[PDB]
Design a protein around this ligand. Sequence first.
Ligand SMILES: NC(=O)C1=CN([C@@H]2O[C@H](COP(=O)(O)OP(=O)(O)OC[C@H]3O[C@@H](n4cnc5c(N)ncnc54)[C@H](OP(=O)(O)O)[C@@H]3O)[C@@H](O)[C@H]2O)C=CC1
Ligand SMILES: NC(=O)C1=CN([C@@H]2O[C@H](COP(=O)(O)OP(=O)(O)OC[C@H]3O[C@@H](n4cnc5c(N)ncnc54)[C@H](OP(=O)(O)O)[C@@H]3O)[C@@H](O)[C@H]2O)C=CC1
Ligand SMILES: CC(C)(C)c1c(C(=O)N[C@H]2[C@@H]3C[C@H]4C[C@@H](C3)C[C@@H]2C4)cnn1-c1ccc(C(=O)O)cc1
Ligand SMILES: CC(C)(C)c1c(C(=O)N[C@H]2[C@@H]3C[C@H]4C[C@@H](C3)C[C@@H]2C4)cnn1-c1ccc(C(=O)O)cc1
Ligand SMILES: [Cl-]
Ligand SMILES: [Cl-]
Lengths: 265, 263
Amino acid sequence: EFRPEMLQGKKVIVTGASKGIGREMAYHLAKMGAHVVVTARSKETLQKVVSHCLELGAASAHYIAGTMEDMTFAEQFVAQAGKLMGGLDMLILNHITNTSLNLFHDDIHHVRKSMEVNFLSYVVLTVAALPMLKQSNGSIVVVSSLAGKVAYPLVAAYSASKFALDGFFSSIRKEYSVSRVNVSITLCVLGLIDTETAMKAVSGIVHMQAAPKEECALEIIKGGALRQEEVYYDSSRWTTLLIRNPSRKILEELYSTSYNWDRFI
Amino acid sequence: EFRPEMLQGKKVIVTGASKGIGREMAYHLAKMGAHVVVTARSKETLQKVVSHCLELGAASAHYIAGTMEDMTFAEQFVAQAGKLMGGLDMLILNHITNTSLNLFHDDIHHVRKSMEVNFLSYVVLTVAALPMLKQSNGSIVVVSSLAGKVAYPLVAAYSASKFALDGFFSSIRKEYSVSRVNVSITLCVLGLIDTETAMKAVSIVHMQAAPKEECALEIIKGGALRQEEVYYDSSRWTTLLIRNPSRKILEELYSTSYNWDRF
Ligand SMILES: NC(=O)C1=CN([C@@H]2O[C@H](COP(=O)(O)OP(=O)(O)OC[C@H]3O[C@@H](n4cnc5c(N)ncnc54)[C@H](OP(=O)(O)O)[C@@H]3O)[C@@H](O)[C@H]2O)C=CC1
Ligand SMILES: NC(=O)C1=CN([C@@H]2O[C@H](COP(=O)(O)OP(=O)(O)OC[C@H]3O[C@@H](n4cnc5c(N)ncnc54)[C@H](OP(=O)(O)O)[C@@H]3O)[C@@H](O)[C@H]2O)C=CC1
Ligand SMILES: CC(C)(C)c1c(C(=O)N[C@H]2[C@@H]3C[C@H]4C[C@@H](C3)C[C@@H]2C4)cnn1-c1ccc(C(=O)O)cc1
Ligand SMILES: CC(C)(C)c1c(C(=O)N[C@H]2[C@@H]3C[C@H]4C[C@@H](C3)C[C@@H]2C4)cnn1-c1ccc(C(=O)O)cc1
Ligand SMILES: [Cl-]
Ligand SMILES: [Cl-]
């Protein structure tokens, strides 16, 4: 179904691309011959990722360094990236604030910082990217987790922010259908993935088994390119089968049928 | 299974109690003879509510007016309410920032205000109530929506905040089990309900609303019975289809596979 030629010459933004899954996606897009604008806080690591993207064969690879804590950076970054590539075809929202496995006690500051970085910044980015994506019949790719579909201990603030992405983007997708906005939204529900961040977070939990970041990153690109609503990627075949909720799809399809919202458009 | 005597003499907080579902819950708790501390921004409507609660037979009814936009109010309110009742048995988190059905365009301010009011304030109130509920083996009751389990158009910021409550509280419930915290968490997944707010928002041809009075009772029954989730819609189709057993199987496998005792 998917072809690598589908990404050739496309204008793609990847957030949290200095390392992990974001970096792997940037490299994948580069091998496919895409124009890429990557971001993270570290200018040096980004410069190393951009250098490799050009070697891989990216049509054009650029970086803009800043913190997604700053909503003015987030808004401006989209404009600057859009000018560099002369448009936008895909927006890959992937960055997250630093998190570790820990019991929740009193950390409102972490809960809010998770909400601002992992969620609000995504909305600010989308808002700023939507005119370019509308004129290119584009794609938003939102990187979530199993922890953003199912409840796990030790990642309460993280789970709260990934659950919010589902609520927001799945709702805005329903709206795009009514308001006939031909911009696709892909929510990526990932299991544990073997990035240095995750592997350092999980050190010692021997029974916990990570999936390849390389294939994971490809599966995210394939999903958005094919305009799929949801992408699932875990190492367990048990999880992949059980993660899907058809009961939700039924309730959503019934409301889509039962109501006409044309007197809002 | 449930008995009204279960709430007699209990120390309950109800947020967003000047109107709608919150008001109805306060009155229900008053009929059952509980000690109640109610909150919303309007002092006068709250005073009329605290006066009806005493007539209905509440053991003690009090009000503290303020905005849950203010996290310091939220934190302090719990301490003050706790002092007025000399403890805390149940925390009923119900308030929300004003929302209407509309397409999302550029409203970051609404998305953030919805997250501060509908979500963060709940975490602030929970943190502040926890020692008191711990010493009383208490209950947190979180009022969510179908829109906090399933995706609907025109309530993006609202859906995002109700989805966050699920993520946060369901995760902390897993933690309370590991850390052996005997404080229950009830998430209430409500369908459309006939409150003036809802009926004004829907003035949506075919939408059936459910009775606010029964709804409010069903929320009390659920928390009192320490149920993890409460479902209340007018459709029998919705109530059957709203449950996610796939996620409970996944949760039970992780509960089994891992031991987190060193946390
Ligand atoms: N790996 C896993 O096990 C799982 C990953 N996921 C999701 O995958 C995505 C990527 O994760 P992963 O590849 O492991 O992460 P990494 O930690 O390896 O990469 C995170 C990236 O985000 C950047 N970043 C961190 N903080 C900020 C900030 N405040 N502002 C801007 N950029 C920031 C980092 O660079 P810098 O610090 O230099 O700014 C880096 O480029 C996330 O959305 C995560 O939730 C989902 C489930 C599991
Ligand atoms: N009604 C329905 O159809 C549905 C309701 N729900 C949920 O049920 C709960 C109650 O809804 P409902 O009774 O219909 O709503 P209402 O609008 O009737 O009542 C909301 C309450 O919150 C208070 N409140 C509003 N803004 C603030 C604020 N900034 N700070 C503090 N308090 C505030 C209000 O008091 P005041 O203005 O005086 O401060 C009021 O008492 C909510 O959690 C809602 O999401 C879920 C699904 C459907
Ligand atoms: C680690 C956990 C639970 C949270 C998880 C995730 C996730 O979102 N992990 C985050 C990543 C970024 C941050 C650092 C690390 C890695 C921890 C978390 C914060 C994705 N799958 N998954 C998971 C792992 C194992 C199993 C299982 O064996 O049953 C099921 C699901
Ligand atoms: C109104 C809507 C969709 C969002 C909804 C809710 C909800 O969250 N209602 C709140 C009310 C108060 C505030 C203003 C309004 C009304 C929106 C919300 C905030 C709870 N069920 N439900 C709903 C209604 C009908 C159907 C159906 O016929 O298939 C399915 C679900
Ligand atoms: Cl890595
Ligand atoms: Cl009302």
